[PDB]
């Protein structure tokens with residue numbers, strides 16, 4: 001009849017008659033699994049063969065997949081007015097693997113992941129779609145992990161008696177030895193035994209998982225999932241997140257400024273109490289929203305902040321939000337401004353208003369490759385390029401955070417260990433960066449991101465200095481906070497992969513010099529601004545050196561704390577040389593930079 005048993009009949013191979021209407025199969029999993037006290041991931045998959053190009057499949061009304069031979073459309077979610085929706089353009093003809101991940105555990109994410117693998121004749125994995133995230137809410141996830149129905153119906157088939165062939169249908173579970181960071185990044189692939197080796201190949205680096213998931217245990221619960229041989233295109237791993245109610249730029253900014261998962265902002269129910277969420281996450285999200293709702297163009301951010309701070313009670317909601325957290329506002333608004341500007345310049349089809357609601361495409365970028373590009377279909381999305389950050393190079397010693405009282409749990413000993421780890425991973429020190437506390441948190445944990453800057457376009461980029469004393473001058477608030485006090489900031493150490501050194505140049509000229517622009521372009525071999533390259537030269541005639549990293553290069557830095565403290569009793573004062581640890585000086589010489597263009 002209408003029913004069939006997916007995991008028993010299609011574990012090897014089945015041919016489903018679709019000529020008489022929809023076919024359905026219950027997918028039941030032992031409830032003891034969804035109720036585990038630990039954490040795990042259920043990986044549901046099946047290979048769709050002949051007939052996979054004229055289908056409308058569904059898991060209850062929670063997830064729908066429409067395949068017409070050209071695209072595979074996905075839509076679903078728990079929220080009734082704005083379905084989460086995605087569309088994957090097929091890159092091949094033939095069989096494809098349908099995959100969805102359901103997390104289990106008490107503090108689990110409230111969404112599922114969905115992805116598609118295209119397979120060649122040899123049954124090898126040839127292409128992989130982006131990893132799509134669909135918000136479900138806690139209760140619906142529980143239902144998807146225990147009892148849901150899989151529906152299959154022919155859709156615009158040209159067959160007189162349509163059929164669908166399915167093979168290797170099944171479900172597995174991986175239990176960790178609560179950590180959910182991999183789930184939101186490219187490392188989610190590292191949790192899936194069925195895809196061993198993919199992350200290493202595409203990210204060009206080992207999974208290097210922390211103990212929790214490193215010691216995972218895998219088990220097939222039903223059916224017989226496939227483990228495809230690889231013949232995959234080197235396309236970087238990507239994620240795509242659709243914001244049905246808009247607010248993507250605000251969420252992206254909050255996630256990058258605060259080091260909070262992007263998907264925390266698309267949750268069905270907002271978490272409460274979380275310190276970083278209440279103090280940074282929601283405030284930053286709201287600030288960007290207010291700016292967008294005020295109908296202000298991003299190129300006026302500096303003046304908007306200046307006016308809000310200069311006149312109490314002015315600016316209304318946005319003005320008050322800014323005055324409430326001056327530096328956090330500057331970080332948030334300049335981050336959003338830079339991303340909106342980039343989005344608009346991606347194509348004539350993008351504008352400032354659209355940047356506010358565009359999907360976010362997150363890329364797992366190899367550190368040695370050239371520039372990190374997303375899928376052809378990502379030109380209409382906000383983009384994030386992810387590389388290893390300081391968060392991975394802090395070593396043991398406890399939680400690190402930034403405060404006026406100094407960097408938490410950070411000592412010379414810890415710095416030396418971190419520096420050695422960086423060397424072992426192929427990184428090299430290129431200088432110091434001084435900044436305010438909130439920016440230090442963003443940069444070290446979330447990674448360096450472009451921010452709008454009020455300076456000539458040709459000189460925009462990430463500013464650092466080999467001399468900690470020059471960077472120290474920037475390590476403080478540039479404007480008093482709500483309580484009218486200029487806080488000391490933090491001094492940070494900036495590293496880059498050694499493979500990036502050939503792109504570092506030096507000049508004897510000061511950047512203000514009229515000959516500067518042309519000379520730097522001659523050295524880097526292309527028009528400014530800087531891209532995967534950098535320039536070092538005197539900050540002024542007879543001055544200390546300053547280094548600018550092009551934003552693409554800045555994004556792949558690893559930034560960690562310096563053991564040189566900022567003096568809370570002398571904010572605005574010069575760095576006292578005796579406060580620099582001798583052992584930190586010993587690991588702070590700078591590389592030999594090129595003084596001529598490449599041959």
Ligand SMILES: [Cl-]
Pocket residue numbers: 022151152153
């Ligand atoms: Cl149906």
Ligand SMILES: [Cl-]
Pocket residue numbers: 412581582583584
């Ligand atoms: Cl020392």
Ligand code: NA
Pocket residue numbers: 053054067068069156157
């Ligand atoms: Na079709």
Ligand code: NA
Pocket residue numbers: 061062063064075076077083
């Ligand atoms: Na639906």
